[PDB]
């Protein structure tokens, strides 16, 4: 890991994955489950109303 200035590919890829994963935790919670709770009520209301 210590040759981090010698392997910018490996480093930048690791920076990308971490950001992706912690970004992914908030994304799941805040967006995904919100989607699982609102989506069926929204489909029912809007279908019946349509």
């Amino acid at each position: 890991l210590t040759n981090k200035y010698y392997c910018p590919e490996v480093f930048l890829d690791a920076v990308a994955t971490k950001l992706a994963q912690t970004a992914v935790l908030f994304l799941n919670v805040e967006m995904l489950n919100d989607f699982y709770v609102r989506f069926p009520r929204e489909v029912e209301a809007k279908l019946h109303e349509h």
Partner: protein, 315 residues
């Protein structure tokens, strides 16, 4: 001077809402409390009637329960109509029906004060309450003393025939207000006294209070009339109590003064009241945070969630 009434009306609307928020809504805004002795108490009821329009009062009254009068400026409204808040959506045209019902409650006789709402273009919006006047009797004073203590604006009335020292109203207003800073006095039944006799009473230094006293004689088209007589009568002794005389009288100036005072004192309690409401909003918001993480929910979301479940289940 419409910008001027309007501030009061929104304030009284606010008085009614703080009133109606919930169980812990200990908090409120003040309003006029009216107290008078027996001859003085008759004078008070008559005056209050004289003040906007004729209304069921007097005859025999238990006076067991207070009556909260909340008034509304009524521009664009053509019928003298007054309604009961609990008696929802019911509007009364003739005040004789108001006399039969509110008197039917007086003989029904809890200690709950009936709220009233009356709309008339002639009346300026106000917010007075009339509790039983001093004359079982211990029970009655317990209530009066209560109501008066807290910083309401207190309206004492006094019959001219009785001396000032004698009357319970003014003396109790001096029991709960030694500085007389929050209390105005009305001298009633003043048509049967010499003008010297009016200057004795309308102006005194023996028991002086801010906001002064207001002498007035109170007793269809009755409004206009009580108005035309008040204009006409000072004419006999225009000097003794007319413009620039130190005393103040007649219904129009008194109503001006009441507006002003209500507007002043309410404006005053407004900051601390508002502080209090903010405290009760902060509490409720934080509970929303510790419980349910402040996340939204409608009953329709809850039922839809459960029905999607039950359907996968049954399949």
């Amino acid at each position: 001077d419409d910008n001027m009434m309007f501030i009061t009306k929104k304030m009284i609307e606010i008085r009614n809402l703080l009133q109606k928020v919930g169980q812990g809504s200990t908090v409120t805004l003040p309003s006029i409390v009216v107290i008078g002795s027996q001859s003085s108490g008759k004078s008070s009821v008559l005056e209050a009637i004289v003040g906007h329009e004729f209304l069921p009062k007097g005859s025999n009254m238990i006076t067991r329960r207070p009556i909260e009068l909340t008034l509304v400026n009524d521009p664009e409204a053509k019928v003298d109509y007054g309604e009961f808040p609990d008696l929802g959506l019911a509007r009364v045209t003739d005040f004789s029906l108001i006399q039969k019902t509110l008197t039917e409650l007086n003989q029904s006789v809890t200690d709950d004060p009936i709220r009233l709402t009356i709309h008339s273009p002639n009346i300026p919006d106000l917010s007075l309450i009339d509790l039983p006047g001093y004359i079982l009797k211990r029970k009655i004073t317990e209530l009066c003393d209560k109501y008066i203590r807290g910083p309401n604006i207190i309206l004492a009335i006094s019959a001219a025939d009785t001396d000032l020292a004698n009357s319970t109203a003014l003396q109790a207003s001096r029991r709960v207000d030694p500085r007389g800073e929050r209390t105005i006095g009305v001298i009633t039944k003043m048509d049967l006294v010499e003008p010297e006799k009016g200057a004795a009473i309308l102006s005194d230094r023996q028991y002086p209070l801010k906001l002064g006293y207001v002498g007035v004689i109170s007793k269809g088209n009755l409004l206009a009339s009580i108005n035309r007589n008040e204009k006409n009568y000072f004419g006999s002794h225009p000097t003794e109590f007319g413009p620039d005389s130190g005393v103040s009288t007649g219904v129009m100036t008194l109503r001006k003064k009441l507006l002003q005072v209500l507007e002043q004192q309410m404006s005053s309690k407004l900051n601390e009241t508002t502080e209090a409401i903010q405290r009760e909003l902060e509490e409720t918001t934080y509970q929303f945070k510790v419980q349910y993480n402040e996340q939204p929910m409608s009953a329709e979301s809850y039922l839809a969630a459960s029905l999607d479940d039950f359907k996968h289940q049954f399949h």
